[PDB]
Symmetry: C2
Subunit: 235 residues, 2 copies
Amino acid sequence: DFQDQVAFITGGASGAGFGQAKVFGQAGAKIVVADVRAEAVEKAVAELEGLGITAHGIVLDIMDREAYARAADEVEAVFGQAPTLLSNTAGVNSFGPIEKTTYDDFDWIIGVNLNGVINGMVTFVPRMIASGRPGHIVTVSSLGGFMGSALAGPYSAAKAASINLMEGYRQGLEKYGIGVSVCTPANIHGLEPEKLAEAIKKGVEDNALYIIPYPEVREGLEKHFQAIIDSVAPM
Amino acid sequence: DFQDQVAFITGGASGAGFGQAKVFGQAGAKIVVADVRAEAVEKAVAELEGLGITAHGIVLDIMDREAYARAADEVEAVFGQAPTLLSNTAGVNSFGPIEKTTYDDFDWIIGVNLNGVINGMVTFVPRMIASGRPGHIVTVSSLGGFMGSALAGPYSAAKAASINLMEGYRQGLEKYGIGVSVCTPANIHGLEPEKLAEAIKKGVEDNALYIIPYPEVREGLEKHFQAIIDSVAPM
């Protein structure tokens, strides 16, 4: 079903990224695990190979644009083609009062959660297009991207951008047979990494723009959106 | 009504920024015009002084964090206090296919429309808090911040973040008597800079979170938001 697909997953050495490596892997995909923790990568790929998944490990900080370019080249060297599935899953956060936020807080958190995914998009989109093969791109953002917050301020803002940015690329890339989705998990008991992974794979199959496997958030989301609509000036 | 308020306006040498300088100025506010075009600043302040507004000009690229800090100091030197009104209005854009976007496109556009306003917030928020005076903060974002697009991709994403970020700071700063608003103009015939300026001043008075003086967009916004709500997994 995903046989002879190549999937490039950031933050794939853990959590939702690893879950995706596993779930896509079990469907037949060749996996590239891109993560910044060299030790965790090593482990993650051993464990994937243990499961009969063909998997390559790339230690990478997605905030480094030129290494991200080396990786992309590396992927073509190893598997003989650019990825046909890109997953921007790597994320980081830290909690505290939004007024107390510092430049380093911003650079780190905006860095991983927004600039990282831009780097992902700029690196791979032209290669995926030049391949002339169908493809797909998923970004795991966050429910916080739909609503700013006083304790996860920088994180929420970056996620709001990555959601909006995926909305854009969906429109741009449809003409290339490349679908685009954004997953917004509820991280504000809690959906397991493999359960979320299966939701994402389903969304990829369905070519869904939004992947929101949390029936419980609907009320809150409707409320937040109505508050905006109510703000529109009459008449 | 705004007498003995000090207002710091980015991109105030033109368009919606200048409109605000004028409208706040005519209400009694002392104005700081912060803009990157030294010539346009000079002109803008001459024209404000011509109108009986006390106005100071600061040539500034809001992407420079340390100059933004020099400015803030400069403001306290000139008017003897930190601003009691911050307006992050400076913006830039360029149109083209989102897949063709380049790093320089991203750095410039994310730079002004998001990083600029972060720099604005980090610089002034502590000073405004330390003043122990009531205050207010407005960011002029965009309607595109509510919905990603294939031709204004980077711009829309940055604006989505600045909206979300203001949502956050509103919550954080309420306990400090500092209100926060975000204005989202429809720039996707068109509302005049002074008309938008008056809408913003009203929103500041009303302490409104959202300032959306465009009755016509309501249908589209409701539609976009419903599409998201419809994506939430049953049950």
